[PDB]
Amino acid sequence: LNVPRKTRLYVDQTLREREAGTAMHRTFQADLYLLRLRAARAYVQALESSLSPVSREPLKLHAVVQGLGPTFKLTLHLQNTSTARPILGLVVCFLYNEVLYALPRAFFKVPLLVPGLNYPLETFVKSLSDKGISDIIKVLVLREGQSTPLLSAHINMPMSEGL
Amino acid sequence: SLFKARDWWSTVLGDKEEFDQGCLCLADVDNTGNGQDKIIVGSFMGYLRIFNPHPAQAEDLLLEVHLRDPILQVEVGKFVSGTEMLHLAVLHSRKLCVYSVSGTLGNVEHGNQYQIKLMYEHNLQRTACNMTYGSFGGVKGRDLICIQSVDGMLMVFEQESYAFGRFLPGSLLPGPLAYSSRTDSFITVSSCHQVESYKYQVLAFAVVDWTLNIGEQAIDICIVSFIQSASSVFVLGERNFFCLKDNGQIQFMKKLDYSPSCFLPYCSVSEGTINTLIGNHNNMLHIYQDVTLKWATQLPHVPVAVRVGCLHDLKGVIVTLSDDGHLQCSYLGTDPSLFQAPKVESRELNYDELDMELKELQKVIKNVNKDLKVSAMVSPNSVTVKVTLKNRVALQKIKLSIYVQPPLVLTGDQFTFEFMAPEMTRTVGFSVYLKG
Amino acid sequence: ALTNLEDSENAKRAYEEAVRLDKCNPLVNLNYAVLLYNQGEKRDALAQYQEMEKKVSSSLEFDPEMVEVAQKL
Amino acid sequence: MEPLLLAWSYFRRRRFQLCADLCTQMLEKSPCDQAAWILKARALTEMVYVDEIDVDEEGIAEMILDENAIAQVPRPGTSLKGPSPAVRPVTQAGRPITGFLRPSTQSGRPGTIEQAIKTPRTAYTARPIASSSGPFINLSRLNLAKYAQKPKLAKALFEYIFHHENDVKTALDLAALSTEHSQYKDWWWKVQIGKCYYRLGLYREAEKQFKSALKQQEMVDTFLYLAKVYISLDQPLTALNLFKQGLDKFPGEVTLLCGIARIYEEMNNISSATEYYKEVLKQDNTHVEAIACIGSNHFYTDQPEVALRFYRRLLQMGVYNCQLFNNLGLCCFYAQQYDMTLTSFERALSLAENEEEVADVWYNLGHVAVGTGDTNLAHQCFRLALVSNNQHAEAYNNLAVLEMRRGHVEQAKALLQTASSLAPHMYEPHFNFATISDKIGDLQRSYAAAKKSEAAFPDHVDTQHLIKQLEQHFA
Amino acid sequence: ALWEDRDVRFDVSSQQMKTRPGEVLIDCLDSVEDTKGNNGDRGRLLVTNLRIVWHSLALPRVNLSIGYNCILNITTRTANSKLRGQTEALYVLTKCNSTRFEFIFTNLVPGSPRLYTSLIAVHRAYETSKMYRDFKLRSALIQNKQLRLLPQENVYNKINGVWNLSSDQGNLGTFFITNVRIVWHANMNDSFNVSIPYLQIRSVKIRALVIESSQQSGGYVLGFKIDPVEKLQESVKEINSLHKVYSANPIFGVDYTDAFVAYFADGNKQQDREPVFSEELGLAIEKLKDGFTLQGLWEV
Amino acid sequence: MFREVLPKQGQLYVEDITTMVLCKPKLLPLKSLTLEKLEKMQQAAQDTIHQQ
């Protein structure tokens, strides 16, 4: 068989574990407690800013960028993830730096999202800076009666390769 | 501690001073004869300092004299016409000064003073850049000094006065100068990538004995001669590391992947080989057996002009001197230390406050799983629409856009507002008209 | 594992969970009796011994500790 | 003290701002001084210098629109164009993830311009692909025929034009005039002309100059340059023979052994790349490349303790990254050292200068958590990896696995579809989607997913049983 | 006497954290979490005049006190990108009586990281000013014929012909008296000068101008002798007056448990074995640990 | 002086059930020096552009 081999490192490590197992157990439990703390912290901060592209109220969105050159094709793949329930009133709003990117329609309604179909909703981003400047673009999907985004996404726009 | 340069007597050496190569010298300028060396450091700020370190402490600094003009390339050699006792050479930009550090003792550790006497001086017509010292020709018991110039010229003093001076053929930026005794040749690295060796008597008669086109210009050149079996000449470029023969061709070379700053081929071990140690700009020392790394250490600062010497009964202590003002004698750290979490029974995890915060955050999580007014007014008359927005709380990064339809066209699309104090109104006005 | 990790209260509550959630394995009862007797109680160790003997048979080393925690209690 | 002296000493100590700062003065003071002129030129060209050897970003146009390999379909084992994807993560259909990203990594090549465009910009190079791979001195004002006469000026001027301004045509003009001034007897100008050619596109015209420079004087530089040229013409076995020739010249060079190992890993026969990286170690023992590569290989072939040693070595040598500490965390956890595991991930999260590095650290923390149990912590870590890097397919796949563990089948289906859309070269999202589909039915989707799984990891086992069952249901 | 800028103490009392007379607080920052000790507990950081202090802000007992004459490197690390704001971190490396510690300070709330700058500044001010609170031999004090004064220093008494009862033949030298320190140069090869700070003086008495050091520069007894003793007792009494009026409020010239074991910079190492020669490398190397060899530690 | 007795028999799978697989832990590849220098020179230009 291909049963692995173990070197001096393994027996020294097992001897350390056999002689100092209690301290390892205690410190790993402390580290796990601190990790749960920090993960809950970051999860709550994300819920606050609503920066999760995956978040009752079922949705899933991710934005793909395609193309070099001053004009990029930005396609938002959006999807309703539910057994059988459509989502009527939703709308997408883009947040960009109006001095670097020229978005024609930075806000538009989305079609009735049928559960199970990936809707590609695309736009044409265009770099305006004569010098190569890469700035982030935010996308917020939100209801039409609410003001807090249902979910969000980020895209680091690549360099322009302009003229 | 493994692969660190563990600390020995260490110090900081002034108030934002600046040093360079040649500054750090390490010999018996005191002429005691016991073998223990003494650190000598001179900045081009002016201060010349000499130390006899002991393993911070006050009495370590032998003296801290100050000369008016800057200091370049302090050296220690037989720079006096009469006797065979080591004297200290100080090269100011337009000055040469030989001194003599005479230490008289009192009946207490700190009752002993040190006097530097101006043995002689030399007004320098040209502006000096660096120098070398050695027994030019086949003389013995004397250490002549060949100083360079910033504009190429090299002037030679026969330990007493201005012997002569000849211009280097075809050089613009002066590089590192050295003198090989097994070939009696001044070896330099011209601006045009040529490592050139000139026989001494050839320059004395004014040409090139030989040249070698290395790929770059060198930072330092250190001809080492404690081995009489096979002589070699070390040349440290700014991208490579060559060890050349005595005829002029590469004996071997290393293509360093870092940026060297200083190197010193110190005492060797095997037969024919030569141990050397080089200092990165990445704060490391590397210890090669002529091509092959035998050890590496993390230095505290960027080493400039490292040296290796016996300091207070400990042979082979490494003395480094940064260009900002640090200085440190050190010994390698050879202690592989167990990678293991520290046992600190005193330091416990405070479960109360941490559990409070975790209960708060988990409450938010398990709870979520179950400010501005806008108004538009259209004129009764290309109709002009006016949009007024008013905030309750102070808001930031406001962007207002208008979307009508494809055929209808707006005279204004986007409006950007920055921070606004609470209860502040903002009005925008645009015009919409049919186009198509 | 908690008995050898300087945490006996957690071992107590884990053994309680186990005995509540175990029905047809006397090894749990015998090991909890061993924990109790080593804790200096000797009172509830008899309760765990009686729980085991109510539950009951092949292991060579669970046989001896069965009789050694019996005779020494 | 003096201007020229202080500036030159600033140059020696690699300041590169002060040097120019004093020369600019010294040039305003005197319009006729060439020492400070070329000194400022050196400082400017060395603030930005990067050696041409390890700059091999062909991009996209070179990859398809430029054909230079003689053989079109050469024998498998003589062209550039181990652990299975069930253990080692992958980047393409094959090509398992490597240690020590270098800017010369190609790591597979696209087939068509459309595929190369419609993929992530950084899926074939360490940097996003590109279509093509006041002022101190105006290049259109100086007569290169007069600076060529003065080699002391010509060398620094060429380095300036080539590495600072990136003007290959004027650089080549200067280098040609200089080489004809030296009567073709200095290997440096030949190497520089060869570099000008190599980045103009002319490989054979560059190999000529590199060969003629090797004839003058053997140097590691020219050997590595010829190695690049030969690798560009898709000739590994010529580059290996040339490297062994160079090692015959320089008996223990580390860059040559490392190039041999890089070529052996591009050809994907690790059993010799490990030997050559071990030779590099016997020479250097601080080499980040060889140490990282042998460490990764030791980790993935179920020997995480040796990999932990190899990475603790880099920790001992002052390396302080986000990658190194996450690696130390993975090794410590999988080598069963639970005391130094999570503090390494904390240092990693601290050191991460990106949003993808943070996402990868959170992904690995979720792996730690799911190895500990407590699937909720891993759920949060995967969701945070998504929140940091939206196009993180492994996080989608693992979060869908945990969702289907909970019971939410539609969430898992959507997340696996997203993962398989982001990374088609991976096999786990396809296999899981096919598995869940077959569990509920929809044998058409199960077939369309299991076939893509077999396309991704063609030697899988469960995929074969799935395909057999499906093709049996179809009759 | 003064330890705030000379040691590194853990679990310090609520009184020793209080500003010493000569000390003065400069900047503060709340919610600075402590790391290199994985307690995950917040705190408050203080950059005082002589040392940096950190107290847990919830259990203010557990705390840290790091002196400025015991730090080697201070590094700020700007990372943890777009996911939130650019938060910083402070890495301090310390070496007290040959023991290397490292502390890390993480600014949790990314809304106030300016503190980590000022510290660096004041640390320079701590090192550029050591002639105020330390004892030095044979330094570069004298100008052409006069004394080079510190920023906050003026001379009081200018006495010529003051001997030094620690040498034999290089004695007669001027004696400068200032409000921060007292110096004596040699007036003949004027590099045998001693610059004693009032901070290091323990008691100025007569046995003759005997000056004792405060257990930090050792038991350095300094003896000087002058002309007829009238001016001598005058100088002694005025020196004692200046010493007391300084010790009232020190100057410092700064212009503008198992706790240790969890903060080692090396890792389970508070030690340095005797540095001995090494025949293998040719360098002074730390002693090897009972069976280890150089060529066995080097390979992997 | 009694030692707790441990069962000598482990849990053995008696059938292979198709379970959804997870992606595998990802060792972040290190960088070269040229790559770091190139990225820093690329971002320094951005910083100077924003700082003018």
UniProtKB/TrEMBL annotation, chain B:
Organism lineage reads as: Eukaryota, Metazoa, Chordata, Craniata, Vertebrata
Question: Which segments constitute the PTHB1 GAE domain?
Answer: 382-436
This one is known as Bardet-Biedl syndrome 9
Give the coiled coil ranges: 344-370
* Span of domain PTHB1 N-terminal: 1-336
TrEMBL record, chain D:
**Domain of life where this protein originates:** Eukaryota
Q: Which Pfam families match?
A: TPR_12 (PF13424), TPR_8 (PF13181)
Q: Where are the TPR repeats?
A: 322-355, 393-426
Q: Which GO terms describe its molecular function?
A: RNA polymerase II-specific DNA-binding transcription factor binding
Q: Name one GO biological process term.
A: establishment of planar polarity
Residue ranges of coiled coil: none
Query: Which InterPro entries does this one have?
Result: BBS8, TPR-like_helical_dom_sf, TPR_rpt
Q: Which UniProt keywords apply?
A: TPR repeat
Key word Disulfide bond present in the record? no
One of the record's GO cellular component terms = ciliary membrane
Q: Which PANTHER family match?
A: TETRATRICOPEPTIDE REPEAT PROTEIN 8 (PTHR44177)
Query: Per its record, how is this protein called by name?
Result: Tetratricopeptide repeat domain 8
Q: Where does this protein come from, organism-wise?
A: Bos taurus
Query: Which gene name does the record give?
Result: TTC8
UniProtKB/TrEMBL annotation, chain E:
Nucleus found in the keyword field: no
Where is this protein localized, as stated in its record?
Cell projection, Cilium membrane; Cytoplasm, Cytoskeleton, Microtubule organizing center, Centrosome, Centriolar satellite
Q: GO: which molecular function terms?
A: phosphatidylinositol-3-phosphate binding
Write down the superkingdom of origin. Answer: Eukaryota
Q: What is its main location?
A: membrane
Asked if the Swiss-Prot or TrEMBL record annotates the protein with the keyword 4Fe-4S, the reply is: no
GO annotations of cellular component type: BBSome; centriolar satellite; ciliary basal body; ciliary membrane
- Where does the signal sequence lie? none
Give the UniProt keywords, A-Z.
Answer: Cell membrane, Cell projection, Cilium, Cilium biogenesis/degradation, Cytoplasm, Cytoskeleton, Membrane, Protein transport, Transport
Which GO terms are recorded in the biological process aspect for this UniProt protein?
cilium assembly; protein transport
Give the BBSome complex member BBS5 PH domain ranges. Answer: 23-77, 153-207
Q: Which CDD domains match?
A: PH-like
Q: Give the matching SMART domains.
A: DM16 (SM00683)
- What's a Pfam family this protein contains? BBL5
Q: How does it associate, per the subunit comment?
A: Part of BBSome complex, that contains BBS1, BBS2, BBS4, BBS5, BBS7, BBS8/TTC8, BBS9 and BBIP10.
Q: Could you tell me which PANTHER family the record lists for this protein?
A: BARDET-BIEDL SYNDROME 5 PROTEIN, BARDET-BIEDL SYNDROME PROTEIN 5
Q: What does this protein do?
A: The BBSome complex is thought to function as a coat complex required for sorting of specific membrane proteins to the primary cilia. The BBSome complex is required for ciliogenesis but is dispensable for centriolar satellite function. This ciliogenic function is mediated in part by the Rab8 GDP/GTP exchange factor, which localizes to the basal body and contacts the BBSome. Rab8(GTP) enters the primary cilium and promotes extension of the ciliary membrane.
Family, per entry: Belongs to the BBS5 family.
| Protein name per Swiss-Prot or TrEMBL | Bardet-Biedl syndrome 5 protein homolog
From TrEMBL, chain F:
This entry carries the following GO cellular component terms, namely: BBSome; ciliary membrane; cytoplasm
Q: Domain of life here?
A: Eukaryota
- A biological process (GO) annotation for this entry? B cell homeostasis
Which protein is depicted?
A: BBSome interacting protein 1
User: What organism does this protein naturally occur in?
Assistant: Bos taurus
Q: Which gene encodes it?
A: BBIP1
Q: Which residues of the full protein are shown?
A: 7 to 58 of 69
